């Protein structure tokens, strides 16, 4: 632990995102983080090249999705407008 690198990318949905995410919990955590598991080819994030597998999500489309289920998290993420603001963190063990 030494303060990760969180950043939000502003991209437009051409025809979907095409990626994978997994919910993980721990101690002293009353919420759930939408981590990244993989990225589908030809996706808005894959083609542009911003996020990668093994990352952590915080905010999507300017929405504080801190403490939601994967279903509500992923669903809301894909359920965004033309503009998308995904805030991913830089880390790894």
């Amino acid at each position: 632990m030494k303060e990760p690198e969180i950043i939000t990318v502003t991209l437009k949905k051409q025809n979907g995102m095409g990626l994978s995410i997994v919910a993980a919990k721990g101690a002293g955590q009353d919420k759930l983080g939408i981590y990244v598991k993989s990225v589908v080819k030809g996706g808005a994030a894959d083609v542009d090249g911003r996020l990668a597998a093994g990352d952590q999500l915080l905010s999507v489309d300017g929405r504080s999705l801190v403490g939601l289920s994967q279903e509500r998290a992923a669903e809301l993420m894909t359920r965004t407008s033309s503009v998308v603001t995904l805030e991913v963190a830089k880390q790894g063990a």
Binding site: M17, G18, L19, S20, I21, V22, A23, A24, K37, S38, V40, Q70, E71, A74, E75, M77, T78
Partner: peptide, 6 residues
């Protein structure tokens, strides 16, 4: 702890 696709 599942893996969905958005």
């Amino acid at each position: 702890l599942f893996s969905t696709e958005v």
